[PDB]
């Protein structure tokens, strides 16, 4: 009579379909998803230091638009800019706005040290009706609007050296007056000019007399520029009119900091990977949530799903 | 599939085997039973965990990068920024697709291999006492009670004990 | 006596050599080519909308050089620029020519809407001998050359808002006069200036008195600039001389459009993939025809040939 | 090559077999013949078509990109544009080279596998009625006419019918 | 590992075999010896040299590229330059990691395959004159002196010469 | 009695650990390193033509700072810039310094042809105390400092066509005077301007009166620009003051040339692959020495080591 001995393998009633080199649909006993495709919808406030811009762009917090006064000297791993943001100080533009935004974002601090410039031969602290601070005509906190002193305006020539061990970052500007009603009123002459230089660099700017289309009822503009001054180097400001002057310098650091555009709310939770849609887990090697990420994140891919087999071929009974 | 055991000479899997991936079924004087083989099951499982350890929880930190969405038309520089990112995503998407297709082919083949090795090991063990019926089953040409079947599963089966009985059964008329 | 049963496999008299992981030359029974290496030499006019520039660059068709009059308001999936092209209107340059070319190419339309600007205080429609249209001194169709009115030229100040739901694209320019024979003749004063601004942006330009080396016998130049005006925003043109003004705006769209440099002829055929050498088929995953492509195309690689085995190893008899 | 059948224990291929990839040759009382095996042939073919379906007709649409040829010297920005494109082409060229080398190794191995599986299946079928001569051929120790050979090819061969005849031939002196 | 010979049914390697990768050990009337098999050794070696020829000495020339270190803060354009280079390095680093992991899995499997093929070839050669003991060794059921052992290693062993002697030893009581 | 025949494989007492798809630590009999991780520390002077900049930047050798006089007309495959370099002629800046540096580096030659410009109406060959050549006040060898002739300075208008078959490269500049002590002394009037144009291009520059922070005791600056003139085209220099003029043109070539920042010494040896750390061998496909390379080099990867198995699994006795 004897016996029979049969070798065999398991199978399951609920198999999953995977792709292979030779077959786009093979059923295996089990698989796991390699593409992360969902967020909880909130940016977790840990373990990265988050700075919610709220109504303020990075640039507005930098210049010191009064509604951004709470941002003075703050640091961030990630600054979050909201779509609801708006400026509410003097109208301005920044040639190469994107680069200034980027280099501040990456520096990851708004640390500002005040400096005593020898401003004699002008009226400091010019203000306006479009930049309301504490219910009183004001200006950008980090800028110093310079106007005349008694129907006159001589050739300025102020110097300030960098004896520190970090790059100093100087933000400064030009006023472009709406007509000749504010070219003979705050500067006392027909023409103006500004020259901000160093040992290695020189930037010069011409004020522009002309009307602009109103932005919150003001038809004049400021134009914002910047200058980096290294250790051992010096800043010079030659000016014959129109100077929007620095009150000091920002410290520029290097590290892991950045900026992200998102309307997702900030949650009280812990997640290493942030996208504009919210935090996502990072167990999986790939993700299709957003090409924009910050932190230890899965890599962005075009696919919705990629199933890795974790069992043998399923051959049901 | 490449070794020919799973979805080949073994007609199908056993839904009733829930405590292992590979194993044995027998019919003898004392009835019909099933036991899982732990070593072959654990071999397949370790290899798949090896693949998992390479892919799960292994991410890369990135911080400040380039912008990837734009609200204004700008031309040259924006074209390059978009192109760099689109290039990168296509290369990673390619890597992910190929990875899964290759790993999956290999997982299917290694699991088939483990079945085949257990079958082969068992065949050698039986020496002249059994014949391969071609469907993963051996006809054993001697009385082989539960302890005897257990001895084969446990690698303690002594083929000399039964050889005279089996040769006589095998080469009859 | 018995019998003999032999298991075996096929072989062929004409094998092909392929590469493998362990051997750079193994013969298999059959293979297929994965690199596309030939074109028919013609750009198929289907299924993409082709616009042959012929004698015109995109920029000449945009500005409206008389020989490009047939291009007014046309659209394209792919604009083809020919090496034989040349300008035959007023000599000009475009700072960042490449960016303007790119953004128009990508927009994929020359749709132009005329607009009524309040030009009083100047003579409109200036012409010249270098821009012959219909056998008569003319100018760029989309530009309006503005000169004096009776030995005088006051401060212009024209406004035009964008109430539409698309970006408006404004093309405008400066004239740079050859000497003082055309600085006191068309503008009636020593000096000039142009300021084209919006709510968010401002561009200002100084005319330049000076002789240039002749290009089709003319030693003056125009310089071309552009301005994008979004929905809700406004365009302002302050000018005290020298303005080459828009007659209206171009619509800017987004989609699949582009531009390609090629001398290949346009054929009456259907092909998804276009290169500068002509259309190519797209059955194969790779191609070594051209790194420049448009449409559903194989990916460019450095190799001439890559043979994928489609049969077993060939072991001849 | 990895299984050892094609370009291994099978000395060479058959140019005379034009209706299949794998098959049988026999010598018996009624002559010497050849028949193709459709199932193994179709198994190999399906797998290769699977690879083809992944690679043929699967292209990506691209539209406006960056410029890739230049008539003027410009420096920094042009360097970056050229570098991005050269980087991309080298990565794709690498992908194409590796793909072909791996797929080709695997095609050679899977086809060898299909030969090996057919051989193995046939060996089990014959039980104690034949012996492996080591060159892909079996010596069958019984009269096996055309219908009998056909029964082996068709999977209907009943080994018990011939077993007494074969054992007697096998274990003679 | 995928064939089951090396680190499977062969318990371990032989440190005393210094003139080949694969070979034979025997015990017979004349003593206990060892000889390397050159053909299987050379098969494995050629395949690994094939991989080496693809990877060693095959570099790419590059000349003027982009800058990759910077002494000044600049923003947008510098971000893109750094991003392009970081993107590229991650893709190549990925390629190198995957290459080594795959080639290494395949080297281990091909070498196991060569052991398995030699074992299989030797088993067929012995026909009915020996049995597989399950540990890579055959019990040979006939007097097999040094010349006889040499005949098996050299592929000149004539199994008919010993078959009567061996069958008689194999099927005793 | 019979015999026993055992099949087997080798093993070694000194195995090496490798990674695989299924196991991060498997011991094999032998392996080889795929990542090159060491340099000898010297840049081999063969087989690429090396030009050690020593105290000179490429730009200083180009402009012709006296200490760089030995570099005139030299060629290179690779120009090596040293961290110890410094300028010792007139203080200057180059807007888009990086692009000029790059295009000269890539051209791979300093070949300079002198040209006879019709300079009448000015004093040529201006010198200074900050650019000492052969113990005598001098200037940049390839520039020609143009000042007045007898309390006067008329409108210059010099032309020079390119009849050659290569691009000509013209280097030129503006002087920015420290005060009005050197605006009425070398140019004889209140104001100045420079316009360097061609058939296709025009660049114009305004001199800037103002003091800068001293760099080797000089508070004036030059600003350096460049112009490429193709075959069939012409160069024009209109100038009313302040011109730092070319003495001729550089030939611009194309080929394999570049530039590298390194302090590694130059050795008398032969190596195809150069990094800033020194030459490295190129047997291996990958390297972790430096992302900056020149020549036939292994590809840069993040890993320190990658071991490729060259033998079977080691299973010791
Ligand atoms: C089909 O195939 C998959 C993959 O092989 C199997 O899923 C795995 O199952 C194991 C065991 O159940 C899981 O291990 C557990 O991991 C938990 C960590 O959770 C997160 O992190 C992992 C990555 O590390 C993510 O993949 C995962 O999605 C989670 O977000 C631990 O918390 C668990 O610990 C608990 O149990 C152990 C017992 O050993 C205790 O030590 C602990 O105290 C604790 O109680 C555990 O280690 C693994 O996460 C699963 N992986 C995946 C990718 O899902 C399926 O089991 C399999 N299905 C079948 C039917 O076989
Ligand atoms: C060596 O290996 C290759 C690849 O395995 C084989 O070539 C293939 O052969 C098949 C069958 O002959 C071909 O199938 C045909 O495809 C045609 C489409 O043509 C274009 O598109 C394909 C991609 O889809 C391109 O690869 C190709 O180059 C063409 O540009 C169809 O029109 C055919 O249809 C005709 O026959 C069928 C019969 O089933 C009918 O239904 C139709 O009415 C019509 O008459 C057909 O489907 C396939 O294109 C080939 N591929 C390649 C890549 O070349 C060789 O056959 C093989 N050689 C040997 C000796 O075996
Ligand atoms: C462990 O595994 C590795 C790889 O399989 C083995 O190392 C190889 O061994 C061979 C033979 O000894 C070496 O071949 C020799 O190459 C020399 C060239 O040297 C440089 O270039 C190679 C690339 O081509 C680099 O990889 C290498 O690092 C060197 O920088 C030749 O000069 C040699 O020629 C000499 O011997 C031959 C004999 O045939 C004569 O023709 C010549 O006249 C001359 O005397 C030789 O060709 C090979 O370089 C090694 N490769 C690597 C990557 O190291 C180990 O042998 C192996 N270990 C064990 C114990 O097996
Ligand atoms: C961030 O700003 C919002 C919005 O307030 C501004 O909305 C602009 C569109 C514009 O109209 C501007 O004049 C206006 O001030 C603040 O919410 C608003 O706050 C005001 C004053 O406290 C309230 O009257 C409103 O209820 C409220 N509006 C909405 C829609 O919520 C908000 O206070 C501010 N947040 C922070 C953190 O400063
Ligand atoms: C596109 O232009 C060509 C070329 O015409 C121009 O060639 C320039 C180099 C220059 O000399 C310019 O003055 C000249 O007009 C046109 O072909 C030419 O057309 C003229 C006038 O009809 C004929 O006399 C010529 O035979 C002919 N020349 C050539 C070489 O073909 C062509 O008409 C025009 N195409 C379109 C579609 O507008
Ligand atoms: C490259 O320059 C070095 C350094 O010389 C300069 O160092 C600057 C920091 C600055 O002080 C400058 O004034 C100074 O000339 C040359 O080496 C120096 O040469 C001088 C004069 O021959 C000697 O007195 C010094 O011994 C020597 N100093 C050092 C530190 O080595 C060097 O000659 C020159 N090399 C070439 C190839 O031109
Ligand atoms: C240039 O034109 C603009 C638009 O007409 C002028 O701005 C308007 O001026 C009126 C009356 O002075 C203001 O009440 C409006 O708020 C402005 N309208 C718009 C739509 O912005 C501007 O003043 C003109 N320039 C000069 C110098 O007069
Ligand atoms: C995460 O956010 C992105 C960006 O908004 C989403 O992608 C966009 O989805 C909208 C609506 O489906 C489309 O109109 C856009 O074209 C998409 N943009 C891009 C850049 O792809 C995405 O759907 C969100 N993902 C999740 C998981 O919530
Ligand atoms: C500056 O120089 C150019 C070149 O000499 C002058 O242009 C030439 O002028 C003559 C006579 O007036 C013309 O007939 C030629 O066509 C021009 N020659 C070339 C080669 O272009 C230019 O006029 C000069 N500038 C001034 C203000 O006179
Ligand atoms: C398609 O066109 C390209 C571009 O002209 C050709 O590639 C050039 O070929 C010429 C002549 O052989 C070389 O001098 C250039 O260096 C090549 N340029 C580039 C960018 O590679 C290519 O040969 C054409 N291909 C086909 C199949 O016709
Ligand atoms: C603008 O300020 C600078 C700095 O005070 C002046 O340069 C200094 O001038 C003194 C005396 O004239 C020199 O001895 C020093 O070498 C300079 N000092 C520094 C720190 O650079 C400059 O002259 C001023 N501008 C004008 C027009 O007087
Ligand atoms: C080759 O040179 C590079 C660049 O200096 C070295 O990498 C730097 O090493 C220093 C000191 O360890 C670090 O502070 C830097 O962050 C590194 N820079 C970069 C860009 O990675 C590298 O160590 C040298 N390699 C060898 C083999 O000598
Ligand atoms: C199959 O069913 C069980 C129980 O319902 C479930 O936990 C398991 O995840 C399922 N597996 C797959 C691969 O769908
Ligand atoms: C300008 O304002 C600041 C900040 O309120 C103040 O400290 C300073 O005294 C003011 N300066 C002058 C010159 O009044
Ligand atoms: C072999 O020959 C036939 C008939 O001439 C041909 O159609 C086939 O494509 C050839 N195959 C290869 C792989 O060269
Ligand atoms: C300018 O020319 C256009 C187009 O021919 C014409 O409609 C318009 O009336 C002209 N304008 C004036 C002010 O004459
Ligand atoms: C093992 O030892 C020998 C002799 O000492 C040595 O040459 C060889 O390279 C070593 N191999 C490995 C893989 O470590
Ligand atoms: C300027 O110097 C050069 C070079 O020393 C000399 O050949 C030339 O004659 C000088 N020019 C004048 C006008 O003196």
Author numbering:
A (entry chain A), C (entry chain A), F (entry chain A): 9 to 325
B (entry chain B), D (entry chain B), E (entry chain B): 1 to 173
Quote the study's own text:
Influenza virus hemagglutinin (HA) engages the host sialylated glycan receptor at the receptor-binding site (RBS) to initiate the virus life cycle. Since the HA RBS partially overlaps with several major antigenic sites (Wiley et al., 1981, Wilson et al., 1981, Wu and Wilson, 2017), egg-adaptive mutations can dramatically alter HA antigenicity and reduce the effectiveness of seasonal influenza vaccines (Raymond et al., 2016, Skowronski et al., 2014, Wu et al., 2017b, Zost et al., 2017). Based on sequence database analysis and virus rescue experiments, this study revealed that the two most common egg-adaptive mutations on H3N2 HA, namely G186V and L194P, are incompatible. X-ray structures illustrate that individual G186V and L194P mutations have opposing effects on the HA receptor-binding site (RBS), and when both G186V and L194P are present, the RBS is severely disrupted.
With the knowledge that HA mutations G186V and L194P exert an opposing structural effect on the RBS and that the HA G186V/L194P double mutant was highly deleterious to the virus, we were interested in examining the structural effect of the HA G186VL194P double mutant. Of note, the HA G186V/L194P double mutant abolishes virus replication but not HA protein expression. We were therefore able to recombinantly express and purify the Bris07 HA G186V/L194P double mutant. Crystal structures of the Bris07 HA G186V/L194P double mutant were determined at 2.25 Å, 2.1 Å, and 2.4 Å for the apo form, in complex with 3′SLNLN, and in complex with 6′SLNLN, respectively. In all three structures, the electron density for the 190-helix was very weak to absent compared to that of the Bris07 HA L194P single mutant, whose structure was previously determined in the same crystallization condition (Wu et al., 2017b). This observation indicates that the 190-helix in Bris07 HA G186V/L194P double mutant is extremely disordered. When mutations G186V and L194P are both present, the HA RBS is disrupted, explaining the incompatibility of G186V and L194P. Mutational incompatibility between G186V and L194P is an extreme form of epistasis and can be attributed to their opposing structural effects.
